[PDB]
Coordinates of C-alpha atoms (C1' of nucleotides) and ligand atoms in Angstrom, one line a residue:
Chain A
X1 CA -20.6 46.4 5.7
X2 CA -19.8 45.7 2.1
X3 CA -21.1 47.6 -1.0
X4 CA -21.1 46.6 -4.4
X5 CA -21.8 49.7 -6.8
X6 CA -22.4 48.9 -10.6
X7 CA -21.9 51.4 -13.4
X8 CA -22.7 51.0 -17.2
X9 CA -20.2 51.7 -19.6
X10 CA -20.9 54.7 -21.9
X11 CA -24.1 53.4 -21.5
X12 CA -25.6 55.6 -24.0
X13 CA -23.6 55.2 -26.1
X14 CA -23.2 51.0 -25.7
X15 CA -26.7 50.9 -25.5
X16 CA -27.1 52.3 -29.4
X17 CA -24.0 49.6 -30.2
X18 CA -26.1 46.8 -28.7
X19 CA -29.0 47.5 -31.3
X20 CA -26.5 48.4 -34.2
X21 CA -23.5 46.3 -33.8
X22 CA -21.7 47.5 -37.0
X23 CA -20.9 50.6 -34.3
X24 CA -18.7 48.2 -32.8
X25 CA -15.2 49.9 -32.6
X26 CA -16.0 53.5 -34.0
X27 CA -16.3 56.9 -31.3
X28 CA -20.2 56.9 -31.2
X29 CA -21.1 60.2 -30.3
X30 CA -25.0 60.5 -28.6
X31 CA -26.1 64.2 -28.6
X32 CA -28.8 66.6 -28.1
X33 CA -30.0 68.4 -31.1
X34 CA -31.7 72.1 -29.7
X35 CA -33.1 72.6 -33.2
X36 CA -31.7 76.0 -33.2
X37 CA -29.3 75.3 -36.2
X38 CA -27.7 72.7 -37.8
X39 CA -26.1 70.9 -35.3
X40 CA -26.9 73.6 -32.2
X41 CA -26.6 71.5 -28.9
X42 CA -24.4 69.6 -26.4
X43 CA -23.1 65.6 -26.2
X44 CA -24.6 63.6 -23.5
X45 CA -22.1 60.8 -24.3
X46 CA -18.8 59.6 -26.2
X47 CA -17.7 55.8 -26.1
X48 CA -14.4 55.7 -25.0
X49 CA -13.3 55.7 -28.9
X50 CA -14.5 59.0 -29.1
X51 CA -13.4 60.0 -25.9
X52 CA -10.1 59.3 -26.3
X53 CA -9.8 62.0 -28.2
X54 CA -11.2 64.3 -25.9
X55 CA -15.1 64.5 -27.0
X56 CA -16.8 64.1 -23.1
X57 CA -20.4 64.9 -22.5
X58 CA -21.5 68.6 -22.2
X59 CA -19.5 70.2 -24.6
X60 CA -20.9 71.7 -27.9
X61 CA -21.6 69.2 -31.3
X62 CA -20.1 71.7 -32.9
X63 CA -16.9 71.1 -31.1
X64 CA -17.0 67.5 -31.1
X65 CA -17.1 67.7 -34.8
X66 CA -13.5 69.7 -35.4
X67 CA -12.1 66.8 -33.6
X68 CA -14.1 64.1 -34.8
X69 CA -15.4 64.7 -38.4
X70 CA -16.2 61.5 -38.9
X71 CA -17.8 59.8 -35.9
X72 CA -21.1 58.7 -35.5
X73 CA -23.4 61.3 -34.0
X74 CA -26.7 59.4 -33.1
X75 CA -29.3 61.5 -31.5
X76 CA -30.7 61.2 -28.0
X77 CA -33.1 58.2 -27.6
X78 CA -33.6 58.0 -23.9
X79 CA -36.8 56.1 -23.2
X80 CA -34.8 52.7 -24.8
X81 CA -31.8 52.8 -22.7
X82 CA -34.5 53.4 -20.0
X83 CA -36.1 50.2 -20.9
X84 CA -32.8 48.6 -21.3
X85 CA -31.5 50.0 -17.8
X86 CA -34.6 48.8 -16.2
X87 CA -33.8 45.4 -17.1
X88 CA -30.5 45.4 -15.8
X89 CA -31.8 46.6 -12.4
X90 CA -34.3 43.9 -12.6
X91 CA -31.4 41.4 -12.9
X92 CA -29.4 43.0 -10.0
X93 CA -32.5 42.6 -7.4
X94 CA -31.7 39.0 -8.6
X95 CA -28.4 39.7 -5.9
X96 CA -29.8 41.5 -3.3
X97 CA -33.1 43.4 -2.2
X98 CA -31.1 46.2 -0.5
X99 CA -30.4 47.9 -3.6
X100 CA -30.2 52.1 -4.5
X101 CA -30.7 52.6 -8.0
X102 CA -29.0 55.9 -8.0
X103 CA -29.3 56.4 -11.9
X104 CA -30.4 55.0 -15.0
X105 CA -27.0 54.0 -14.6
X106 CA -25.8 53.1 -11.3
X107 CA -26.9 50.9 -8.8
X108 CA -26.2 50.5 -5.3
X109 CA -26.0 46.8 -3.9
X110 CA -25.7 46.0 0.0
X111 CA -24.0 42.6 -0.3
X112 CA -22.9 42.8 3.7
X113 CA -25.4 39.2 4.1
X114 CA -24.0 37.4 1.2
X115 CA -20.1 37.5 1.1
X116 CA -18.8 36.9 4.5
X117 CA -15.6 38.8 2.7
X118 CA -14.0 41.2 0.4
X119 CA -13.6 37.4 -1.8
X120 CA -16.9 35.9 -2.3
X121 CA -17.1 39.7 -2.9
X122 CA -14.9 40.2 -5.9
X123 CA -16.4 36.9 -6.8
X124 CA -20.3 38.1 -6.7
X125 CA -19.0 40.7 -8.9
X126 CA -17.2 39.0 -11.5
X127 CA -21.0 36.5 -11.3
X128 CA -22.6 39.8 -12.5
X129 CA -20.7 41.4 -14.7
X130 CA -21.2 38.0 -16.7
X131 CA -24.8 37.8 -16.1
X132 CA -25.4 41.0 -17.0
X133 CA -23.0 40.6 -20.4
X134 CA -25.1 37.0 -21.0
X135 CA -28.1 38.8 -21.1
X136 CA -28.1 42.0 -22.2
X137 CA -24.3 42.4 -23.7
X138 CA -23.6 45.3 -21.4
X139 CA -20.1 45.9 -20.2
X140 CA -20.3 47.1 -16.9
X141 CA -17.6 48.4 -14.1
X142 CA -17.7 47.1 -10.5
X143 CA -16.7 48.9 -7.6
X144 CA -16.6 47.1 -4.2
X145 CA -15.6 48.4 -0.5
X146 CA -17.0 49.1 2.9
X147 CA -19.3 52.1 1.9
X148 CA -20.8 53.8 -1.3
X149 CA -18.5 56.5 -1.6
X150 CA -15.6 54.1 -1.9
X151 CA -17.5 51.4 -4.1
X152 CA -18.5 54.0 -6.4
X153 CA -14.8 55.3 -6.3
X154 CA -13.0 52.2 -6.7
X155 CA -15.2 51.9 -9.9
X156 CA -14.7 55.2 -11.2
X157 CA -10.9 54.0 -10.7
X158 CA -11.3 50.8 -12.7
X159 CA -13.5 51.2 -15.7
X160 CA -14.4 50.4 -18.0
X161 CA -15.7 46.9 -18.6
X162 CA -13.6 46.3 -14.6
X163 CA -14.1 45.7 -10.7
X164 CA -11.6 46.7 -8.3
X165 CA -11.9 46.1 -4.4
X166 CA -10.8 48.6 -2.1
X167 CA -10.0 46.6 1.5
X168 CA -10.0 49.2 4.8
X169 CA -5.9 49.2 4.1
X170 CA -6.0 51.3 0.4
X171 CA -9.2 53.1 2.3
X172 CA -6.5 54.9 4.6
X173 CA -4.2 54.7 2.0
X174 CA -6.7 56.4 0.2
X175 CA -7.6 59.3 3.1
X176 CA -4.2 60.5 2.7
X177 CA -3.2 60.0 -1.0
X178 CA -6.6 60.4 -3.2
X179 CA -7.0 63.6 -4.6
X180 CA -10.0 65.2 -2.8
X181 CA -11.3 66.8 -6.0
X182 CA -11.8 63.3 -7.0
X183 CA -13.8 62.6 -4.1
X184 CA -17.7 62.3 -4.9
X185 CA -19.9 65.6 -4.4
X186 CA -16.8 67.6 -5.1
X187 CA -17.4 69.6 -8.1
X188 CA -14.3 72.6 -9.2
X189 CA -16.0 75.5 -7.1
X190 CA -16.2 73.4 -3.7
X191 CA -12.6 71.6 -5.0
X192 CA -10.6 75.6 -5.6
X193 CA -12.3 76.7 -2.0
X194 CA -11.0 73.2 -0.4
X195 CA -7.1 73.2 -2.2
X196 CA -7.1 77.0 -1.3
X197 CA -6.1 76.0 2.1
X198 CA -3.9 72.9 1.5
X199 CA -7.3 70.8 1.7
X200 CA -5.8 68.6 -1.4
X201 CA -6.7 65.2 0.5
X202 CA -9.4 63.9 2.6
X203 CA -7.2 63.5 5.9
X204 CA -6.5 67.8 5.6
X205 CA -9.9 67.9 6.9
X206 CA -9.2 66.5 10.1
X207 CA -6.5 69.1 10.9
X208 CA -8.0 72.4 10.0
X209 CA -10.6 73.5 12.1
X210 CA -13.9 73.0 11.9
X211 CA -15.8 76.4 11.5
X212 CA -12.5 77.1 9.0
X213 CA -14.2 74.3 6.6
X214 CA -17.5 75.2 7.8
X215 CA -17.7 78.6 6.9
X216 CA -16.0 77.9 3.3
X217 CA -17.8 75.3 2.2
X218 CA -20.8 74.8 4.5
X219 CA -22.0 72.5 7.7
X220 CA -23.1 69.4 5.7
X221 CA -20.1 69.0 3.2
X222 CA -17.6 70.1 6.2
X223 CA -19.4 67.3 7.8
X224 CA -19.8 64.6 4.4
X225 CA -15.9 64.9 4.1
X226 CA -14.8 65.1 8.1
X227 CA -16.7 62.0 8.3
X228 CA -15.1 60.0 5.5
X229 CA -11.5 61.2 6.8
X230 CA -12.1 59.7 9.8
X231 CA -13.6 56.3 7.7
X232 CA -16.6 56.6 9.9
X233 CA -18.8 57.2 6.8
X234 CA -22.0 55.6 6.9
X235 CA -24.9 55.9 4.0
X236 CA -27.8 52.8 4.4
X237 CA -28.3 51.6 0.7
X238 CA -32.2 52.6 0.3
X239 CA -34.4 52.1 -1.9
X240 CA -34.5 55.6 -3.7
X241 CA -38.3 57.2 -4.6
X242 CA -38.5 59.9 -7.6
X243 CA -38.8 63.3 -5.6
X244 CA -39.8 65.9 -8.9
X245 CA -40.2 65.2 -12.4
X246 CA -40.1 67.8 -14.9
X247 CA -39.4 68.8 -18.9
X248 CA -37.4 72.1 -20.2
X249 CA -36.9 73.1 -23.6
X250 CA -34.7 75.1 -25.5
X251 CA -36.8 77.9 -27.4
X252 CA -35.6 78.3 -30.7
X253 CA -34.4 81.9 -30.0
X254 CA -34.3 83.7 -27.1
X255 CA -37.2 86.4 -26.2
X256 CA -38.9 87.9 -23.2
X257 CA -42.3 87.7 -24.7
X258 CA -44.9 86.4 -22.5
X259 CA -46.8 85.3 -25.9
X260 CA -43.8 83.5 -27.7
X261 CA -42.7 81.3 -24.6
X262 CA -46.0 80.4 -23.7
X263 CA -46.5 77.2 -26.2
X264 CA -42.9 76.0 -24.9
X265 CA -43.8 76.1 -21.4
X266 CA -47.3 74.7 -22.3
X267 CA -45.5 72.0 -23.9
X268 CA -43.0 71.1 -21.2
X269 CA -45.9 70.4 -18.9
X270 CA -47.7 68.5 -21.5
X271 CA -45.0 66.0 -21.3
X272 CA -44.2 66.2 -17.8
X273 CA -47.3 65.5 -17.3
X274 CA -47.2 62.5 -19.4
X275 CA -44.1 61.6 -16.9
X276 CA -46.1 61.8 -13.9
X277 CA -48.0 59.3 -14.7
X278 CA -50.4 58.5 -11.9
X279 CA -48.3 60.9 -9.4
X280 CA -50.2 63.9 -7.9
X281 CA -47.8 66.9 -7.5
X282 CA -48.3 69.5 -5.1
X283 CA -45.4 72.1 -5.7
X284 CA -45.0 73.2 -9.7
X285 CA -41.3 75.3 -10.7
X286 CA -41.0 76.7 -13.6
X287 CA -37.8 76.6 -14.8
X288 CA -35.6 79.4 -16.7
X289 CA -32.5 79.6 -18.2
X290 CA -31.3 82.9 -18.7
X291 CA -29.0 84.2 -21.6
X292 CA -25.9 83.6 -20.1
X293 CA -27.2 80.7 -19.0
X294 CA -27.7 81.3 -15.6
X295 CA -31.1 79.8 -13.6
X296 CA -33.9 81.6 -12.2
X297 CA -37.1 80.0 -10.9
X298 CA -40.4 80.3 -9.3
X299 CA -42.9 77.7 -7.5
X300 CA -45.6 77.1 -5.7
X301 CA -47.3 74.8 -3.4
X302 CA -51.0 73.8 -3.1
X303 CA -52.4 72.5 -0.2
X304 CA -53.9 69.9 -2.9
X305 CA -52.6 68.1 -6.2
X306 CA -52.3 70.2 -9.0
X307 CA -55.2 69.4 -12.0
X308 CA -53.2 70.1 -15.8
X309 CA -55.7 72.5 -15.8
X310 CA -54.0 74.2 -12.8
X311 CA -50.8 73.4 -13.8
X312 CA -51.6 75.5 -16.8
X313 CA -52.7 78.8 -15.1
X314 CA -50.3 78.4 -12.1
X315 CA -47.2 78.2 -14.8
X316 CA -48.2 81.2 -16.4
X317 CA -47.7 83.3 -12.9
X318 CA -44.6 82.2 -11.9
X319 CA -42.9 82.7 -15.2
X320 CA -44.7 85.9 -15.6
X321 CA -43.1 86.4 -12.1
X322 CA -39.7 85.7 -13.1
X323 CA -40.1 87.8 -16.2
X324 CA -41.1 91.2 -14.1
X325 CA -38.5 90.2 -11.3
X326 CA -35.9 89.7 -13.6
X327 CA -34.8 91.6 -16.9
X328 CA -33.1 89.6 -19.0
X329 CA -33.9 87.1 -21.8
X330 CA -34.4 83.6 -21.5
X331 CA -33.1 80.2 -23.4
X332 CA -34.5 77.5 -22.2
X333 CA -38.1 77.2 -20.4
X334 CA -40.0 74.2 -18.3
X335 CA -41.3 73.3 -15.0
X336 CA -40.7 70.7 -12.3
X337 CA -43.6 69.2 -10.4
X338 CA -42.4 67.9 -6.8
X339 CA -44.1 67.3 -3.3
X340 CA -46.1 63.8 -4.7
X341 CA -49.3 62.8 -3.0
Chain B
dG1 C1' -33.5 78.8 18.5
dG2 C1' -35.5 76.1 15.2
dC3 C1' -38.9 74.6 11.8
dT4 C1' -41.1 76.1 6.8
dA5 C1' -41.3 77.7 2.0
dC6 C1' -39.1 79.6 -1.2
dA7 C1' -35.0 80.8 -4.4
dG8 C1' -30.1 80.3 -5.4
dG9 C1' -26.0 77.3 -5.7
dA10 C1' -23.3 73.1 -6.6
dC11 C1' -23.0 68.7 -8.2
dT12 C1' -23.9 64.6 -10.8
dC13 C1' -25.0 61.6 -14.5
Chain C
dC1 C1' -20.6 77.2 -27.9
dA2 C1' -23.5 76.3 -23.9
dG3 C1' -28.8 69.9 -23.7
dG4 C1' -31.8 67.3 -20.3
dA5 C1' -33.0 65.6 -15.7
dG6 C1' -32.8 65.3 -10.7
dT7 C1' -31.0 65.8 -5.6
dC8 C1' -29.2 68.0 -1.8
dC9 C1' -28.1 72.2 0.8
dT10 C1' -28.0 77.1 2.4
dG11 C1' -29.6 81.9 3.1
dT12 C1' -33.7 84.6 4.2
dA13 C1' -38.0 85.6 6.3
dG14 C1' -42.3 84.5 8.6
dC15 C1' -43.9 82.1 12.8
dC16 C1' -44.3 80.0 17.5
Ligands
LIG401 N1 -23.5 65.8 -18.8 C1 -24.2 64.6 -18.9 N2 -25.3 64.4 -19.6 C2 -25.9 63.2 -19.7 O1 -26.9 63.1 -20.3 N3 -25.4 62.2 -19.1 C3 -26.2 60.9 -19.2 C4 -27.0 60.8 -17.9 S1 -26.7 59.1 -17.4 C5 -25.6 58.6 -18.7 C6 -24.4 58.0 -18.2 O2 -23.4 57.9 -19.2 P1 -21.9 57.4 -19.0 O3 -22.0 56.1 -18.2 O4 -21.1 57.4 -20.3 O5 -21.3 58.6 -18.1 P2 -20.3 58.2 -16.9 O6 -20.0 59.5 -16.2 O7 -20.9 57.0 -16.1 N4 -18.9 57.8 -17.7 P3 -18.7 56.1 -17.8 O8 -17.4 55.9 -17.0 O9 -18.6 55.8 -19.3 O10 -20.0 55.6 -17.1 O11 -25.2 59.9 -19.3 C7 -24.3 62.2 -18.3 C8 -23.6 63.4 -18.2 F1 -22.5 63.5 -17.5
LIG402 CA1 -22.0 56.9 -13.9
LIG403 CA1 -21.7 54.6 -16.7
LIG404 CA1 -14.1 65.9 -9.4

DNA sequence: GGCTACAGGACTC
DNA sequence: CAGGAGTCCTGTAGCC
């Protein structure tokens, strides 16, 4: 078939030049603020001014400050590019029905009955990219090829503000050359374990044997990446539905007091359920970081939907749970309501 | 053996 | 110096 993946460019960050144009050719900077301290927190996003210089999302303000003093650091405001991304979604629909909105920022597009080839292709892509800059002023990176993994590669490969094709020639080319840690779902931990037995491209799979790669890095990657070596990967585009929604806080100091993490939690649910909206959850997580920011959790599921009330009561358990099961401190509390009616 | 819930892990944006 | 949100998978144990 042929797949037509879209990504924003420094979205975030593009999204707050849009509004405030005079931004236009400075490192903008987006960041969460914890509250903890002046400037305690993390960047979501750089523009690629900023980035150039190596400020990339998830490292400390802080940081990003030695090395850029001066750039603009705008705080989080996630509900606008939200209502900005949803209009760009809208507009893709406009090209296909069989679309995956994977993110607030990417979107998957099925083109297989529209271009009877990789040319109408590259041409339905350069028709978007200009629709999408005539009415919103987003620059945007296409990625086009024969399934999502490569689509969403060849885009990684060309942005920003580009559209590369990747025919079923560079795809083999690609099975042997690509560096498998730049494949998609292959994060440093599953990447060492893979190059730490040649593994260093795609193909390396289909040498080694199975229960080798199975038993390092489990049945379902072993399988993901066997089956793109042999470019008999197949994904349907589908329309994806919301599975959980949740909230989690940073507390302003850390604390194993039932009593001082209480209107945190209580907050995070307030919100979340704001979120739901009109969805009924029947399974409620609550959510801890620990100290050295590690992850502990505990849930629950109700044969019925869970009343705020409920969700109240129920949060209080389960944390009190992971407090007696666990001994250290946390950082961050919030819960995660799942299972929707 | 395999399906369920639950809790941890890995990854991604 | 370590934010926020969400998805998929695996190991373990109860159950048929
Ligand atoms: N650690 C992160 N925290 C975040 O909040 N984000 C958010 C969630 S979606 C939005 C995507 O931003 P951007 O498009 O700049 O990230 P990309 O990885 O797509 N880089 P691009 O090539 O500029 O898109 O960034 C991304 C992250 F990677
Ligand atoms: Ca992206
Ligand atoms: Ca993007
Ligand atoms: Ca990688």
């Amino acid at each position: 078939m042929i797949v037509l993946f879209v990504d924003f460019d420094y979205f975030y960050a593009q999204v707050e030049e849009v509004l405030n144009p005079s931004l236009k050719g400075k490192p903008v900077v987006v960041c969460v603020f914890s509250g903890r301290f002046e400037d305690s927190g993390a960047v979501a996003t750089a523009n690629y001014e900023a980035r150039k210089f190596g400020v990339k999302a998830g490292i400390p303000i802080v940081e990003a400050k030695k090395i850029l003093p001066n750039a603009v650091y705008l705080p989080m405001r996630k509900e606008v590019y939200q209502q900005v991304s949803s209009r760009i979604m809208n507009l893709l629909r406009e090209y296909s029905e069989k679309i995956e909105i994977a993110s607030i920022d990417e979107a998957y597009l099925d083109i297989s009955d529209k271009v009877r080839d990789y040319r109408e292709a590259y041409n339905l892509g350069l028709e978007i990219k200009n629709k999408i800059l005539e009415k919103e002023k987003i620059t945007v990176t296409v990625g086009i090829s024969k399934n999502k993994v490569f689509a969403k590669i060849a885009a990684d490969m060309a942005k920003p503000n580009g559209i590369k094709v990747i025919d079923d020639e560079e795809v083999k080319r690609l099975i042997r050359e690509l560096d498998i840690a730049d494949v998609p779902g292959i994060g440093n931990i599953t990447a060492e374990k893979l190059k730490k037995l040649g593994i260093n491209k795609l193909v390396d799979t289909l040498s080694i044997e199975f229960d080798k790669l199975k038993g390092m890095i489990g049945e379902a990657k072993a399988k993901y990446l066997i089956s793109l070596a042999r470019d008999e990967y197949n994904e349907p585009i589908r329309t994806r539905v919301r599975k959980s929604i949740g909230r989690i806080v940073t507390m302003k100091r850390n604390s194993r007091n039932l009593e001082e993490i209480k209107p945190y939690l209580f907050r995070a649910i307030e919100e979340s359920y704001y979120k739901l909206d009109k969805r009924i959850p029947k399974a409620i997580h609550v959510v801890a970081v620990t100290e050295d920011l590690d992850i502990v959790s505990r849930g629950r599921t109700f044969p019925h939907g869970i009343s705020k009330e409920t969700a109240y009561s129920e949060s209080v358990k389960l944390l009190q749970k992971i407090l007696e099961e666990d001994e250290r401190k946390i950082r961050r509390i919030g819960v995660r309501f799942s299972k929707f009616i």
